[PDB]
Design an enzyme around this catalytic site. Structure first.
Site, PDB file in Angstrom:
ATOM      1  CG  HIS A  61      22.636   2.632   7.474  1.00 39.16           C
ATOM      2  ND1 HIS A  61      23.055   3.151   6.272  1.00 39.16           N
ATOM      3  CD2 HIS A  61      23.416   1.562   7.746  1.00 39.16           C
ATOM      4  CE1 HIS A  61      24.052   2.421   5.811  1.00 39.16           C
ATOM      5  NE2 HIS A  61      24.303   1.454   6.701  1.00 39.16           N
ATOM      6  CG  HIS A  91      15.318   0.817  13.218  1.00 45.19           C
ATOM      7  ND1 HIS A  91      15.067  -0.536  13.256  1.00 45.19           N
ATOM      8  CD2 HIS A  91      14.834   1.259  12.039  1.00 45.19           C
ATOM      9  CE1 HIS A  91      14.454  -0.899  12.154  1.00 45.19           C
ATOM     10  NE2 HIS A  91      14.301   0.183  11.390  1.00 45.19           N
ATOM     11  CG  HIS A  93      13.111   4.361   8.868  1.00 48.31           C
ATOM     12  ND1 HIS A  93      14.149   3.949   8.083  1.00 48.31           N
ATOM     13  CD2 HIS A  93      12.699   3.265   9.544  1.00 48.31           C
ATOM     14  CE1 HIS A  93      14.337   2.642   8.272  1.00 48.31           C
ATOM     15  NE2 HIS A  93      13.465   2.190   9.179  1.00 48.31           N
ATOM     16  CD  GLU A 103      11.644   2.866   6.024  1.00 51.91           C
ATOM     17  OE1 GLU A 103      11.471   1.829   6.665  1.00 51.91           O
ATOM     18  OE2 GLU A 103      12.641   3.095   5.327  1.00 51.91           O
ATOM     19  CG  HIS A 116      10.443   0.218  11.421  1.00 53.65           C
ATOM     20  ND1 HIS A 116      11.150   0.477  10.284  1.00 53.65           N
ATOM     21  CD2 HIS A 116       9.127   0.536  11.191  1.00 53.65           C
ATOM     22  CE1 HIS A 116      10.293   0.941   9.389  1.00 53.65           C
ATOM     23  NE2 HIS A 116       9.067   0.996   9.892  1.00 53.65           N
ATOM     24  CB  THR A 195      12.314  -0.623   4.795  1.00 49.41           C
ATOM     25  OG1 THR A 195      13.044  -0.207   5.949  1.00 49.41           O
ATOM     26  CG2 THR A 195      10.941  -1.114   5.200  1.00 49.41           C
TER      27      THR A 195
HETATM   28  N1  LIG Z   1      13.464  -0.947   8.532  1.00 52.76           N
HETATM   29  S1  LIG Z   1      13.221  -2.603   9.021  1.00 52.76           S
HETATM   30  O1  LIG Z   1      12.542  -3.329   7.860  1.00 52.76           O
HETATM   31  O2  LIG Z   1      12.186  -2.602  10.142  1.00 52.76           O
HETATM   32  C1  LIG Z   1      14.673  -3.413   9.645  1.00 52.76           C
HETATM   33  C2  LIG Z   1      15.818  -2.647   9.790  1.00 52.76           C
HETATM   34  C3  LIG Z   1      16.973  -3.199  10.331  1.00 52.76           C
HETATM   35  C4  LIG Z   1      18.162  -2.323  10.465  1.00 52.76           C
HETATM   36  O3  LIG Z   1      18.593  -2.027  11.562  1.00 52.76           O
HETATM   37  N2  LIG Z   1      18.760  -1.861   9.345  1.00 52.76           N
HETATM   38  C5  LIG Z   1      19.920  -1.006   9.385  1.00 52.76           C
HETATM   39  C6  LIG Z   1      21.024  -1.639   8.571  1.00 52.76           C
HETATM   40  O4  LIG Z   1      21.380  -2.852   9.153  1.00 52.76           O
HETATM   41  C7  LIG Z   1      16.978  -4.559  10.705  1.00 52.76           C
HETATM   42  S2  LIG Z   1      18.460  -5.263  11.418  1.00 52.76           S
HETATM   43  C8  LIG Z   1      18.683  -6.789  10.492  1.00 52.76           C
HETATM   44  C9  LIG Z   1      19.261  -7.808  11.467  1.00 52.76           C
HETATM   45  C10 LIG Z   1      19.735  -9.065  10.746  1.00 52.76           C
HETATM   46  C11 LIG Z   1      20.736  -8.699   9.654  1.00 52.76           C
HETATM   47  C12 LIG Z   1      20.069  -7.772   8.645  1.00 52.76           C
HETATM   48  C13 LIG Z   1      19.625  -6.491   9.335  1.00 52.76           C
HETATM   49  C14 LIG Z   1      15.826  -5.327  10.565  1.00 52.76           C
HETATM   50  C15 LIG Z   1      14.675  -4.752  10.039  1.00 52.76           C
HETATM   51 CL1  LIG Z   1      13.251  -5.750   9.859  1.00 52.76          CL
HETATM   52 ZN   LIG Z   2      13.117   0.308   9.854  1.00 51.87          ZN
END
Ligand SMILES: NS(=O)(=O)c1cc(C(=O)NCCO)c(SC2CCCCC2)cc1Cl
Ligand SMILES: [Zn+2]
EC number: 4.2.1.1
Length: 257
Positions: A61, A91, A93, A103, A116, A195
Protein backbone atom coordinates in the site's frame (compact mmCIF):
# COMPACT_ATOMS: atom_id res chain seq x y z
CA UNK A 1 -8.58 -6.98 -0.56
CA UNK A 2 -8.65 -3.17 -0.11
CA UNK A 3 -6.37 -0.90 -2.11
CA UNK A 4 -6.38 2.25 -4.20
CA UNK A 5 -7.83 1.03 -7.54
CA UNK A 6 -11.26 1.65 -9.11
CA UNK A 7 -12.38 -1.76 -7.87
CA UNK A 8 -11.03 -1.69 -4.31
CA UNK A 9 -10.26 1.94 -3.48
CA UNK A 10 -11.54 4.50 -0.98
CA UNK A 11 -15.15 4.57 -2.18
CA UNK A 12 -15.40 0.80 -1.53
CA UNK A 13 -13.79 0.66 1.92
CA UNK A 14 -17.00 1.31 3.86
CA UNK A 15 -18.33 -2.15 2.95
CA UNK A 16 -15.58 -3.91 4.94
CA UNK A 17 -14.94 -1.05 7.34
CA UNK A 18 -18.21 0.78 8.07
CA UNK A 19 -16.43 3.36 10.29
CA UNK A 20 -15.33 4.79 6.95
CA UNK A 21 -18.50 6.88 7.24
CA UNK A 22 -17.86 7.74 10.91
CA UNK A 23 -17.77 10.96 12.83
CA UNK A 24 -13.99 11.57 12.97
CA UNK A 25 -12.50 10.28 9.73
CA UNK A 26 -9.26 11.45 8.15
CA UNK A 27 -7.89 13.10 6.13
CA UNK A 28 -9.67 16.45 5.95
CA UNK A 29 -9.28 19.72 4.12
CA UNK A 30 -7.65 22.30 6.39
CA UNK A 31 -9.45 25.56 5.80
CA UNK A 32 -6.81 27.96 7.03
CA UNK A 33 -9.27 30.89 7.52
CA UNK A 34 -11.52 28.68 9.74
CA UNK A 35 -8.86 27.00 11.88
CA UNK A 36 -8.69 28.86 15.14
CA UNK A 37 -5.43 29.86 16.73
CA UNK A 38 -5.26 28.23 20.16
CA UNK A 39 -2.82 30.15 22.42
CA UNK A 40 -3.05 27.31 24.94
CA UNK A 41 -1.48 24.72 22.57
CA UNK A 42 2.07 23.91 23.52
CA UNK A 43 5.12 23.66 21.13
CA UNK A 44 5.50 20.14 19.74
CA UNK A 45 8.35 18.20 21.41
CA UNK A 46 9.88 15.94 18.78
CA UNK A 47 12.67 13.91 20.51
CA UNK A 48 14.26 11.72 17.80
CA UNK A 49 17.94 11.90 18.98
CA UNK A 50 17.87 8.22 20.14
CA UNK A 51 15.81 6.86 17.20
CA UNK A 52 16.68 3.27 16.20
CA UNK A 53 15.44 2.53 12.71
CA UNK A 54 15.44 -1.18 11.94
CA UNK A 55 13.90 -2.01 8.58
CA UNK A 56 12.11 -0.75 5.46
CA UNK A 57 9.16 -2.65 4.10
CA UNK A 58 6.94 -2.53 0.97
CA UNK A 59 3.61 -3.39 2.58
CA UNK A 60 1.70 -3.37 -0.74
CA UNK A 61 0.00 0.00 0.00
CA UNK A 62 3.00 2.18 0.85
CA UNK A 63 6.53 1.65 2.06
CA UNK A 64 7.30 2.02 5.76
CA UNK A 65 10.47 2.61 7.78
CA UNK A 66 10.11 0.87 11.14
CA UNK A 67 11.69 1.76 14.48
CA UNK A 68 12.43 0.03 17.76
CA UNK A 69 9.47 1.12 19.93
CA UNK A 70 10.21 -1.25 22.83
CA UNK A 71 11.65 1.72 24.88
CA UNK A 72 11.19 5.50 24.79
CA UNK A 73 13.83 6.32 22.14
CA UNK A 74 12.00 8.38 19.53
CA UNK A 75 9.03 10.14 21.12
CA UNK A 76 6.52 12.83 20.43
CA UNK A 77 5.22 14.92 23.35
CA UNK A 78 3.64 18.30 23.96
CA UNK A 79 1.56 20.14 21.39
CA UNK A 80 -2.03 18.93 21.90
CA UNK A 81 -0.92 15.64 23.45
CA UNK A 82 -1.09 14.38 27.02
CA UNK A 83 1.73 11.94 27.78
CA UNK A 84 4.30 10.19 25.64
CA UNK A 85 3.94 8.77 22.14
CA UNK A 86 6.58 6.38 20.73
CA UNK A 87 7.54 6.42 17.06
CA UNK A 88 6.51 3.13 15.38
CA UNK A 89 7.11 3.83 11.72
CA UNK A 90 6.85 6.39 8.97
CA UNK A 91 5.39 5.99 5.52
CA UNK A 92 4.26 8.18 2.60
CA UNK A 93 1.31 8.80 0.30
CA UNK A 94 2.04 10.10 -3.20
CA UNK A 95 0.48 10.79 -6.58
CA UNK A 96 0.95 9.86 -10.19
CA UNK A 97 1.38 13.62 -10.93
CA UNK A 98 2.95 16.36 -8.82
CA UNK A 99 -0.45 18.06 -8.34
CA UNK A 100 -1.84 15.24 -6.25
CA UNK A 101 -0.73 12.75 -3.65
CA UNK A 102 -1.35 14.34 -0.25
CA UNK A 103 -4.24 13.12 1.92
CA UNK A 104 -4.72 16.35 3.90
CA UNK A 105 -5.29 19.43 1.75
CA UNK A 106 -4.77 23.09 2.67
CA UNK A 107 -7.46 25.42 1.30
CA UNK A 108 -8.14 22.57 -1.19
CA UNK A 109 -4.48 22.56 -2.32
CA UNK A 110 -3.07 19.13 -2.89
CA UNK A 111 0.64 18.50 -2.34
CA UNK A 112 2.75 15.96 -4.30
CA UNK A 113 3.04 13.70 -1.27
CA UNK A 114 2.54 13.43 2.48
CA UNK A 115 4.78 11.89 5.11
CA UNK A 116 3.17 10.28 8.17
CA UNK A 117 5.25 9.61 11.31
CA UNK A 118 3.02 7.20 13.31
CA UNK A 119 3.31 7.19 17.10
CA UNK A 120 1.39 5.36 19.87
CA UNK A 121 0.50 6.40 23.39
CA UNK A 122 2.66 4.52 25.87
CA UNK A 123 -0.06 4.40 28.52
CA UNK A 124 -1.76 1.73 26.41
CA UNK A 125 1.33 -0.45 26.42
CA UNK A 126 1.20 -1.65 22.75
CA UNK A 127 -0.03 -0.31 19.46
CA UNK A 128 -2.84 -2.85 19.10
CA UNK A 129 -4.36 -1.68 22.37
CA UNK A 130 -3.72 1.93 21.41
CA UNK A 131 -5.74 1.42 18.19
CA UNK A 132 -8.82 0.84 20.36
CA UNK A 133 -8.58 4.19 22.17
CA UNK A 134 -9.64 7.71 21.08
CA UNK A 135 -6.25 9.09 22.08
CA UNK A 136 -4.22 6.00 21.14
CA UNK A 137 -2.11 7.30 18.22
CA UNK A 138 -0.59 10.57 17.14
CA UNK A 139 0.49 11.13 13.55
CA UNK A 140 2.85 13.89 12.57
CA UNK A 141 1.96 14.76 8.98
CA UNK A 142 4.32 16.65 6.71
CA UNK A 143 3.57 17.82 3.18
CA UNK A 144 6.02 17.31 0.32
CA UNK A 145 6.30 19.72 -2.60
CA UNK A 146 8.53 19.22 -5.63
CA UNK A 147 11.50 21.56 -5.95
CA UNK A 148 14.95 21.19 -4.39
CA UNK A 149 15.99 17.74 -3.14
CA UNK A 150 15.65 16.76 0.51
CA UNK A 151 19.13 15.40 1.38
CA UNK A 152 17.79 13.51 4.40
CA UNK A 153 15.37 11.61 2.17
CA UNK A 154 17.99 10.25 -0.25
CA UNK A 155 18.97 7.22 1.89
CA UNK A 156 15.29 6.14 1.75
CA UNK A 157 14.87 6.70 -2.02
CA UNK A 158 18.16 4.86 -2.76
CA UNK A 159 16.99 1.60 -1.09
CA UNK A 160 13.55 1.49 -2.81
CA UNK A 161 14.73 -0.64 -5.76
CA UNK A 162 15.53 -3.38 -3.16
CA UNK A 163 11.87 -3.37 -1.91
CA UNK A 164 10.19 -2.85 -5.31
CA UNK A 165 7.37 -5.36 -4.69
CA UNK A 166 4.81 -6.12 -1.95
CA UNK A 167 6.24 -8.08 1.01
CA UNK A 168 9.91 -7.19 0.30
CA UNK A 169 11.87 -5.73 3.24
CA UNK A 170 15.49 -4.56 3.68
CA UNK A 171 17.58 -3.88 6.78
CA UNK A 172 17.42 -0.09 7.29
CA UNK A 173 19.47 0.83 10.37
CA UNK A 174 20.93 4.23 11.44
CA UNK A 175 18.32 6.29 9.58
CA UNK A 176 17.75 9.64 11.32
CA UNK A 177 14.11 10.86 10.84
CA UNK A 178 15.17 14.41 11.94
CA UNK A 179 16.42 14.81 8.32
CA UNK A 180 12.76 14.67 7.08
CA UNK A 181 11.49 17.62 9.19
CA UNK A 182 10.98 21.25 8.00
CA UNK A 183 12.51 24.15 9.98
CA UNK A 184 9.20 25.20 11.62
CA UNK A 185 7.11 22.97 13.93
CA UNK A 186 4.04 25.27 13.52
CA UNK A 187 1.05 22.94 13.12
CA UNK A 188 -2.70 22.37 12.80
CA UNK A 189 -4.32 19.67 14.97
CA UNK A 190 -7.67 17.84 15.02
CA UNK A 191 -9.10 14.48 16.24
CA UNK A 192 -9.25 11.95 13.40
CA UNK A 193 -8.58 8.41 12.23
CA UNK A 194 -6.24 6.12 10.32
CA UNK A 195 -6.53 7.08 6.60
CA UNK A 196 -6.01 3.38 5.70
CA UNK A 197 -8.28 0.45 6.79
CA UNK A 198 -9.15 -0.37 9.52
CA UNK A 199 -9.83 3.46 9.60
CA UNK A 200 -9.83 3.26 13.43
CA UNK A 201 -10.83 6.59 15.08
CA UNK A 202 -7.83 6.69 17.43
CA UNK A 203 -5.57 9.42 15.99
CA UNK A 204 -4.67 12.93 17.16
CA UNK A 205 -3.49 14.51 13.88
CA UNK A 206 -0.64 17.06 13.98
CA UNK A 207 -0.10 18.48 10.46
CA UNK A 208 2.90 20.80 9.98
CA UNK A 209 2.18 24.07 8.15
CA UNK A 210 5.62 24.12 6.45
CA UNK A 211 6.10 21.57 3.63
CA UNK A 212 9.48 19.95 2.89
CA UNK A 213 10.87 20.24 -0.66
CA UNK A 214 11.86 16.98 -2.43
CA UNK A 215 13.26 16.76 -5.97
CA UNK A 216 11.36 15.46 -9.02
CA UNK A 217 13.90 12.57 -9.14
CA UNK A 218 13.14 11.60 -5.49
CA UNK A 219 9.34 11.42 -6.10
CA UNK A 220 9.92 9.59 -9.43
CA UNK A 221 11.64 6.80 -7.40
CA UNK A 222 8.53 6.53 -5.16
CA UNK A 223 6.45 6.07 -8.37
CA UNK A 224 8.65 3.14 -9.55
CA UNK A 225 7.47 1.03 -6.55
CA UNK A 226 4.85 -1.66 -7.18
CA UNK A 227 1.56 -2.45 -5.37
CA UNK A 228 1.93 -6.06 -6.67
CA UNK A 229 4.21 -8.84 -5.39
CA UNK A 230 7.26 -10.26 -7.19
CA UNK A 231 6.37 -12.35 -10.19
CA UNK A 232 2.90 -10.76 -10.55
CA UNK A 233 1.87 -8.21 -13.23
CA UNK A 234 3.26 -4.74 -12.62
CA UNK A 235 0.97 -2.10 -11.06
CA UNK A 236 2.91 1.04 -10.18
CA UNK A 237 2.43 2.21 -6.61
CA UNK A 238 0.97 5.68 -7.31
CA UNK A 239 -2.11 7.54 -6.03
CA UNK A 240 -2.07 5.71 -2.70
CA UNK A 241 -4.01 8.52 -0.94
CA UNK A 242 -7.53 8.72 0.51
CA UNK A 243 -9.38 11.97 -0.40
CA UNK A 244 -10.55 14.49 2.19
CA UNK A 245 -13.48 13.33 4.35
CA UNK A 246 -16.30 15.36 5.95
CA UNK A 247 -15.15 17.49 8.89
CA UNK A 248 -18.49 17.00 10.69
CA UNK A 249 -18.49 18.19 14.32
CA UNK A 250 -14.74 18.97 14.50
CA UNK A 251 -12.63 22.08 15.01
CA UNK A 252 -9.11 22.33 13.51
CA UNK A 253 -6.83 24.30 15.80
CA UNK A 254 -3.68 26.20 14.82
CA UNK A 255 -0.56 26.48 17.01
CA UNK A 256 0.37 29.79 15.32
CA UNK A 257 -1.35 33.15 14.55
N1 LIG B 1 -2.09 6.93 6.93
S1 LIG B 1 -2.05 6.80 8.67
O1 LIG B 1 -3.39 7.31 9.20
O2 LIG B 1 -1.02 7.80 9.18
C1 LIG B 1 -1.58 5.20 9.28
C2 LIG B 1 -1.19 4.25 8.36
C3 LIG B 1 -0.75 3.00 8.77
C4 LIG B 1 -0.34 2.03 7.72
O3 LIG B 1 0.82 1.67 7.64
N2 LIG B 1 -1.27 1.56 6.87
C5 LIG B 1 -0.96 0.61 5.83
C6 LIG B 1 -1.85 -0.60 5.98
O4 LIG B 1 -1.58 -1.21 7.20
C7 LIG B 1 -0.73 2.70 10.15
S2 LIG B 1 -0.14 1.09 10.68
C8 LIG B 1 -1.41 0.55 11.83
C9 LIG B 1 -0.70 -0.24 12.92
C10 LIG B 1 -1.69 -0.98 13.82
C11 LIG B 1 -2.60 -1.87 12.98
C12 LIG B 1 -3.37 -1.01 11.99
C13 LIG B 1 -2.41 -0.30 11.05
C14 LIG B 1 -1.12 3.65 11.08
C15 LIG B 1 -1.54 4.91 10.65
CL1 LIG B 1 -2.03 6.08 11.84
ZN1 LIG C 1 -0.52 7.53 6.16
Amino acid sequence: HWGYGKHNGPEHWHKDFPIAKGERQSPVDIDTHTAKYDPSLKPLSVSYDQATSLRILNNGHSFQVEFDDSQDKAVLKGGPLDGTYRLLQFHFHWGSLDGQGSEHTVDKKKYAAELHLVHWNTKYGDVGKALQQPDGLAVLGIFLKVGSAKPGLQKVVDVLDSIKTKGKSADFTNFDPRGLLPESLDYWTYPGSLTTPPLAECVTWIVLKEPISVSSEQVLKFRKLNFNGEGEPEELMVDNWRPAQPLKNRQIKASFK
